[PDB]
Symmetry: C2
Subunit: 136 residues, 2 copies
């Protein structure tokens, strides 16, 4: 209503997983995710350890709408395709998803005030789902 | 013939500016540019100081053809639009070009065995044209 504008409302901002990290500091890094709006439907995305200024992960995305059901967070490296479930946006990487030469599988859940991400590399594997809460 | 396939032939590979750097080492860094083909019309691009393994600049691009005259090296951060001159591909950044929050102006020339680049930041300025020669 429109779906893409609602997505962008939820998607934009700064998120961090303090509660997750603090609750098991030896398992989960404390990471800050920033989705900064450049233009309408254009965001600069980045992830950083909270004690660092420089992100370890960084790119710019276009937000595309594919009628009727889909929101695509687009980058040539890896599109993430979101569907509205009735409660949140559920996202999954396209098949050809790669970071920097490594096949990647990504999942994401976008809520009104949380962003959950799940990234798995062919060789490097994964830690599981990060739970990022959106900052005020 | 087709123009986009010729572009991709010239664009793909590894380039470095040894002669430029060596000739004035206090002015020009020795940098290696790699254009690695992931898929048809899909490349992973990176620039690194030659003594480093990790690039300082890194992204994935889609190669798009816009009939009749244009080749677009696409990334949501900054499209570079190339025209065939009769001798080489001349490239210029789209107006909305940004790296990571800084307005950027980019120019490039793509030859059969060289790649020249020119990047200017709003605040940081520029060094001028880098002269990268394509490695065998
Ligand atoms: Mg793609
Ligand atoms: Mg664009």
């Amino acid at each position: 209503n429109s779906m893409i504008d609602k997505f962008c409302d939820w998607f934009e901002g700064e998120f961090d997983n303090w509660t997750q990290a603090a609750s098991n500091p030896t398992k989960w890094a404390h990471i800050i995710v920033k989705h900064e709006k450049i233009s309408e439907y254009k965001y600069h995305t980045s992830s950083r350890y909270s004690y660092m200024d420089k992100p370890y992960r960084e790119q710019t995305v276009d937000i595309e709408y594919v009628c009727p059901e889909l929101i695509i967070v687009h980058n040539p490296a890896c599109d993430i395709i979101f569907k509205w479930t009735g409660i949140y946006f559920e996202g999954e990487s396209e098949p050809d998803c790669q970071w920097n030469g490594q096949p990647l599988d990504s999942k994401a859940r976008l809520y009104a005030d949380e962003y959950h991400t799940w990234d798995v590399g062919y060789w490097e594997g994964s830690e599981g789902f990060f739970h990022f809460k959106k900052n005020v």
